[PDB]
Design a protein around this ligand. Structure first.
Ligand SMILES: Nc1ncnc2c1ncn2[C@@H]1O[C@H](COP(=O)(O)OP(=O)(O)OP(=O)(O)O)[C@@H](O)[C@H]1O
Ligand SMILES: Nc1ncnc2c1ncn2[C@@H]1O[C@H](COP(=O)(O)OP(=O)(O)OP(=O)(O)O)[C@@H](O)[C@H]1O
Ligand SMILES: Nc1ncnc2c1ncn2[C@@H]1O[C@H](COP(=O)(O)OP(=O)(O)OP(=O)(O)O)[C@@H](O)[C@H]1O
Ligand SMILES: Nc1ncnc2c1ncn2[C@@H]1O[C@H](COP(=O)(O)OP(=O)(O)OP(=O)(O)O)[C@@H](O)[C@H]1O
Ligand SMILES: Nc1ncnc2c1ncn2[C@@H]1O[C@H](COP(=O)(O)OP(=O)(O)O)[C@@H](O)[C@H]1O
Ligand SMILES: Nc1ncnc2c1ncn2[C@@H]1O[C@H](COP(=O)(O)OP(=O)(O)O)[C@@H](O)[C@H]1O
Ligand SMILES: CC(=O)N[C@@H](CCC(=O)OP(=O)(O)O)C(=O)O
Ligand SMILES: CC(=O)N[C@@H](CCC(=O)OP(=O)(O)O)C(=O)O
Ligand SMILES: CC(=O)N[C@@H](CCC(=O)O)C(=O)O
Ligand SMILES: CC(=O)N[C@@H](CCC(=O)O)C(=O)O
Ligand SMILES: NC(=[NH2+])NCCC[C@H](N)C(=O)O
Ligand SMILES: NC(=[NH2+])NCCC[C@H](N)C(=O)O
Ligand SMILES: NC(=[NH2+])NCCC[C@H](N)C(=O)O
Ligand SMILES: NC(=[NH2+])NCCC[C@H](N)C(=O)O
Ligand SMILES: NC(=O)CC[C@H](N)C(=O)O
Ligand SMILES: NC(=O)CC[C@H](N)C(=O)O
Ligand SMILES: NC(=O)CC[C@H](N)C(=O)O
Ligand SMILES: NC(=O)CC[C@H](N)C(=O)O
Ligand SMILES: [Mg+2]
Ligand SMILES: [Mg+2]
Ligand SMILES: [Mg+2]
Ligand SMILES: [Mg+2]
Ligand SMILES: [Mg+2]
Ligand SMILES: [Mg+2]
Lengths: 281, 142, 281, 281, 281, 142, 142, 142
């Protein structure tokens, strides 16, 4: 019976964010399982049905890494960013757009909603430029422009967008862009209310060896000191960075949460506690 | 910046100054509320666009990056106050608009000769003063 | 925590009726009780947030009777319909529209949604004609026409409509129309998916003395044989007639449920079991 | 024959205000008769057919007073405003919305146009707040907000709005607002061209004992002095007040005219003379 | 100079197909060659500028084979269709969508137009089902449904759609569909005027040994007798089947042309002669 | 209802009849499914409007009540079948469309002379027969 | 016109006929009212398009002139009645649709074998008869 | 196909028949032109939807594949002609609609009792005959 009286209790939470845009980035690393994966899409679909306007940005570094091993291609990361030569770029685009992006679209469609998967090339949604030390990193990109024109009619027609983090410069050259970075600029480009980063840790950790050292809430000055002090590192760097860049452009909140906790996305939005580290201040 | 000090020494004699602040659009309501809490409640807003290109960096708005010759949206606030209140007001705006990133904004201070309230025909100190405002709040605090 | 894993479990129910219209009649018991009152508006507001398009039609016979006693022109009823002279008509419109309708609008507005209360005169939503027994009942009306034009833009703008069961003929004379009838014809006029009637019983029983003889679901031919065979009777025969008339005009389902229970409207929609007797075409 | 050559002569007058909004307040006191009443609705319908966009706001104090006598409830007015306790508030809403508002809607519908009657609660058209001396006056309201969203689609669809002067604060409490006041703020909220007040006197009178002491035209400084001097009084106070408040917000003219003169509304607009006192200056 | 008197001479050809949809399949030879590549995108872009509404569908069997060799899971074909297990399916989607599709989008964007690359999953543009021979081919799909909703707003906004021939069934399983088939059913779904297939031959010959025995134009009954009578055969019989299936569903014309030649697509449209075999209803 | 019997006695010799049913639009899918379950899968739908005024009662559609002269929406279904199948088909349509209220519908039966399948040029019995249809289902049941 | 006589002599025995009339769309309400006045209140309307090209003249619809191959809008009315009522019904339709210009319309009469009312399961004469209808009106006139 | 022969032997005496053809919507103009070339210029079009499910195959319309219970769009053409012209007309329609794929269409032939031209009150042969039509063209060829 009374499993209804608990649906009732969620009204205030649903009302609070009715109508608002929410950019969710699904970490490649949180994609540990066909079933976890489908719990995340369930959560997205629920948010859409209930009146929020969610947008999925995904990564896929491990899926990429697995194909690089199979094809006998060495891999490198520097401060959370993949060194990317021409050959590797082609593989990146192949896995992110041709495997991950469609795997997710495919799942949403089968959950009774409808998705559209786009890369930055599609409708010129993103324009890339190189990074200063491509010297070292090769074809790694920074986001020069976001043109969200193409998303307007898709959201109007009710489709959920699913975005892959590759794009080209104006001359037509492909670049590999860290998915956190794309998520954050896309959020700013749409004046979104929230940016939410689902990864494979509880949140940001005081100290990365200890999973109970979760920081529940933190401001910008604080988290910048953490990057200096050396406390965030590798792939958590472009995570925190993209939160800061985003907040500074007007996104009201940004959170980092565990993708592999059942229904982490829902806990984060539909409760006061939240489900990881929230940034602002 | 909790302790900025403006230089009004080229305008001795002058009683009024206009504080003109240009900053990020989404800060507008936080700036207006900070001023309201401290008794500044006469102010004028104008949406504008601007350029502030230092070196070869490029500020980031709406996810995209703007350089030389690309106008970028800002909100402007003009606040006319009496000499004594200038440093305080400038500090409140700076502190509440601040983010740390390029394009945060500039504040300019200008001399003003006269103030007139249309409804009453009051002028000068009477016209500039607002009931319930900073000045009155400091007298109740005294 | 668990409050969330149970919100998640409602997705299927939310998806099933997304976008569909639902005419709900509120009356009798549920209507006096303030806890059932605000618990019924909470249920409406949730259904709108979650994607259904609900419409409230209300009654109010008990509050009408109170005013008639005060004015020494006490109620007179025949077979569940109020005998309505010109003086009484004016009091009926005064209470239904000017007290009940606005009380309900007022509550919904304060629950963070936005309502618009209409009578049948407004936008000519309803056109009445004298009932077959005018000669005894006076100004009691049958529904001659429904024009839902005026509701199209109000549902588009997101308003929740709240309808009071009075109207006029073309010559401009007011009539008092039974609110179950208005709810049923309105549902048919909109092609609604459901018509739901809050009553003071469990719904339809095999045998009226035993309250555990609840019929959970039943079709037209089945419920007609029940009237013929006597096995339900009384204050229920009219209610069942307006369900039949409604279903035969294209309404997909019609349920009679126990307005006495907390959150009855939610149980009926957000569960398989339901919260009364359901009647299909 | 030549009763056409006089229709022709009205072209300039019709052209002058083509397309403009005109808020007309129908005084409860001008509602002396089924037939006068219908001459006023005729005039509204004509104005609509001929290209103006009229909006009706009505009062109803005598209809209210009559029910208060019947129900044995004492009545009081202070400076033109009704002292309103909880019981009286309920009666006010009952008569204004459930009797007067629908009587007028009903009449317009029967004149071949279509009306929609709204109170301030409907679509949150008005938000009330108490008045400083509710201390004395009880639940009497001042207009805190006007949100005309709900009127936009109704005028678009061609409906004539008919507005009743009750509303609620944000907490959901009802308030009784003087209908002149509502008319005037509604006019400002819509940038209307004109506000026209139909009452039961020739206009504003030099001296209220003498009906030939009509003031034909007067400015703000002048009429304010009249309120001080004591020359306007009782129910003429919130009449003049609401003209001033309205003009100051950008309504170009405001007039006060006799509701019981056949076709007074038409004379006021379709002639240079006018049909009462006009305010501006 | 003369460059102009010859642009003038194309007016009639431009006018004839103004506003009409045109599904073009790009494959095989033309696709490897970079000069034929960019010369085919140039032709598309011109047709869009000039007023036709073109749609690109591409193949990519040669690039798929390259990756399969690299991964020691070499291609297996029966009657022109690729045997496709789950592993192979993933590689097919990876290459078609993540490499070829985006390479083409990327080129068009850099040629001063704007493309949007879709697979059949995106917007549920295509729904697959197992092909009659699944038992041998595994995950090879026939087209069960086309839903072109998602293309309506993209053509309205002026985007050029570029389609990759993979999709899923309703249960969410991916299938590999032959790109000629997708092009043909898509044309029928849109009521296109033309379907054009770039192949590696002159089109259809009287007698396969002689290449000057090109049939310039032919109807259905005529081309069916040709299959019956053996006079064309081989890799051409399927191509001709998808033309027939397309024409019978309302596509006005279908041509098979020599993708080997520079600017073949332009010749086919901007000249009477054409650039291969045309087949009418 | 499940035992109606049509009178075809003015058309001896005739092999084919057209069952033309007119009923409530929202019944259309239930009728078509019923006919499909029983092997009737050659049928033609036309949306139409009609009038069926008996006495002075008035039928109720879209919540409003239609009388003389007011066209009301209906769906029509034309089904051509062989003489033997007529009573059965009539019964299925009648039963699945039925509600009990006025405006439920009418069924008419018309004689047909010839049937031709365009794809194959088949005529008569070969053209009218559908693979997997009622006839075949009865042979599989036999 | 008011004395047309249909030839039913190839259908002896047959009790029911379908009067199918095709005419100008704006006539539809006048035709339906005429039939209602005279007790015909069971009828079915379908909007259709047609061609009726005699010689080389060209009919005029929506101000423009249609010839061979150009479909032109018409309204169709199907009326099933009993043998006795056929000539009368044909005359009413003809008379009320008439204008005198080409494209006025055609009427066809078809044999019908059976009639069934779904609500009641009535057949034949009982199904075809309408309470208050032409038949009853003539008995009230007798 | 160009030599189909309809069986009218259950309708001896009958002078007129209705050829009712149901086929693919995009064929409509080709069919109408073919009939016009040969002197058939009295015809009526109705857009309809239908089902023609043989076995377990599924017909393909708008790129998607329709099976049991899924209505698919077709165009219908009703042509009333005299007994002699029936086989010829059937052949023309069949031939011009044909493609070879399932869902190509069906043709039905129905008996007709009377024909009336509203403008003139002509009946029977005079009403059915069209100036410039097939009949006249054959007399000009004779
Ligand atoms: N010298 C100036 N005169 C007038 N307006 C100016 C001037 N400098 C800046 N502005 C305005 O102020 C806005 C913000 O300037 P901005 O924040 O770029 O200052 P800046 O000098 O580059 O410092 P920062 O390096 O923090 O960017 C500009 O977009 C422009 O609107
Ligand atoms: N004689 C008739 N000829 C042509 N169409 C008819 C005839 N009778 C009925 N129809 C068509 O059938 C529809 C349904 O008729 P309806 O169900 O009203 O028949 P009825 O005889 O009045 O039975 P009921 O009394 O149950 O209403 C009408 O709306 C009309 O489309
Ligand atoms: N033989 C026919 N078969 C089917 N439909 C016909 C036939 N003749 C006419 N129609 C239909 O009737 C409509 C009206 O025909 P129309 O009034 O043109 O007939 P007509 O014989 O040419 O007489 P008129 O010379 O007065 O025009 C046509 O548009 C078509 O819908
Ligand atoms: N017995 C029938 N009665 C009524 N309409 C029919 C019948 N058979 C076919 N139709 C109509 O004809 C259309 C075309 O039928 P279709 O071409 O599918 O016939 P078929 O017998 O299945 O031949 P094929 O096997 O070539 O498809 C259907 O969509 C329907 O509108
Ligand atoms: N202070 C920290 N707290 C949490 N994680 C950290 C910290 N410093 C580094 N990390 C690492 O950063 C990684 C962030 O994810 P990354 O590897 O880019 O994955 P994704 O982007 O797919 O979530 C975590 O897996 C964790 O191992
Ligand atoms: N100077 C004045 N001129 C005209 N009327 C006045 C004056 N002073 C007071 N009044 C009174 O004000 C009343 C205004 O109407 P009110 O009683 O509120 O009625 P309503 O609002 O229904 O028109 C008039 O009936 C009149 O008796
Ligand atoms: C004509 C007629 O009977 N009108 C009713 C309308 C109220 C209603 O229908 O609601 P409840 O379920 O609360 O009674 C009345 O006059 O009382
Ligand atoms: C199922 C199947 O055969 N799929 C093809 C799709 C590519 C194509 O169709 O294009 P080309 O003309 O360049 O070969 C494949 O797997 O290779
Ligand atoms: C430059 C870079 O690090 N790109 C990421 C993109 C995917 C992700 O963010 O998960 C990569 O792993 O290649
Ligand atoms: C507060 C107040 O005076 N309300 C008015 C409202 C009606 C009117 O204005 O005529 C009243 O009489 O109660
Ligand atoms: N530590 C956290 N994650 N806090 C999140 C705040 C939760 C709140 N529902 C919000 O969306 O704003
Ligand atoms: N016994 C019932 N009334 N059940 C109602 C059916 C269940 C489902 N929630 C619905 O509204 O369709
Ligand atoms: N004393 C007056 N009432 N004057 C009214 C001015 C008349 C003019 N028709 C107007 O609407 O502006
Ligand atoms: N042989 C050919 N394929 N010719 C094509 C026809 C010519 C014309 N440009 C067209 O597209 O219609
Ligand atoms: N801009 C202002 O608000 C001036 C305030 C005024 N100086 C006061 O303190 O009263
Ligand atoms: N209309 C139809 O479906 C006819 C079916 C055919 N008589 C069969 O049974 O095979
Ligand atoms: N189509 C009809 O209206 C038939 C009416 C019936 N013959 C009657 O006269 O009662
Ligand atoms: N339907 C028709 O076109 C009939 C034509 C007529 N039989 C003629 O040949 O003149
Ligand atoms: Mg990462
Ligand atoms: Mg700067
Ligand atoms: Mg008053
Ligand atoms: Mg009927
Ligand atoms: Mg003609
Ligand atoms: Mg078929």
């Amino acid at each position: 019976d009374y499993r209804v009286e608990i649906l009732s209790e969620s009204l205030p939470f649903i009302q609070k964010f009715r109508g608002k845009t929410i950019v969710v980035k699904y970490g490649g690393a949180a994609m540990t399982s066909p079933e976890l994966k489908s719990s995340v899409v369930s959560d997205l679909v629920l948010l859409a049905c209930v009146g929020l306007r969610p947008i999925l940005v995904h990564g896929g570094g491990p899926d990429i890494n697995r194909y690089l091993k199979q094809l006998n291609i060495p891999a490198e990361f520097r401060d959370g960013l993949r060194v990317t030569d021409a050959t590797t770029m082609e593989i990146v685009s192949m896995v992110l757009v041709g495997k991950v992006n469609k795997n997710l679209v495919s799942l949403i469609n089968a959950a009774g909603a409808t998705a559209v998967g786009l890369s930055g090339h599609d409708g010129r949604l993103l324009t890339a430029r190189p990074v200063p030390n491509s010297a070292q990193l090769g074809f790694v990109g920074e986001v020069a422009r976001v043109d969200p024109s193409v998303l307007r009619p898709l959201v109007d027609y009710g489709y959920i967008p699913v975005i892959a983090s590759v794009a080209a410069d104006d001359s037509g050259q492909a670049y590999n862009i860290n998915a956190d970075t794309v998520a954050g600029e896309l959020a700013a480009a749409l004046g979104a209310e929230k940016l939410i980063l689902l990864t494979d840790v509880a949140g940001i950790l005081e100290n990365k060896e200890d999973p109970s050292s979760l920081i529940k809430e933190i401001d910008i000055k604080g988290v910048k000191k953490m990057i200096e002090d050396g406390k965030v590192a590798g792939g958590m760097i472009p995570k925190v960075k993209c939160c800061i860049r985003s907040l500074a452009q007007g996104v009201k909140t940004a959170s980092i949460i565990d993708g592999r906790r059942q229904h982490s996305l829902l806990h984060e939005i539909m409760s006061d506690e939240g489900a990881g580290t929230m940034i602002t201040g | 910046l909790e302790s900025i000090q403006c230089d009004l020494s080229a305008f001795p004699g002058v009683k009024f100054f206009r504080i003109e602040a240009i900053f990020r659009p989404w800060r507008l309501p936080f700036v207006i509320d900070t001023l309201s809490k401290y008794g500044i409640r006469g102010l004028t807003n104008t949406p504008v666009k601007g350029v502030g290109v230092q070196g070869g960096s490029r500020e980031r708005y709406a996810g995209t990056e703007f350089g030389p010759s690309n106008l970028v949206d800002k909100e402007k606030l003009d606040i006319v106050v009496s000499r004594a209140q200038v440093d305080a007001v400038v500090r409140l705006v700076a502190a509440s608009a601040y983010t740390g990133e390029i394009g945060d904004g500039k504040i300019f201070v200008h001399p003003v000769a006269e103030v007139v309230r249309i409804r009453t025909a009051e002028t000068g100190l009477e016209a500039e003063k607002m009931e319930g405002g900073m000045e009155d709040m400091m007298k109740k605090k005294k």
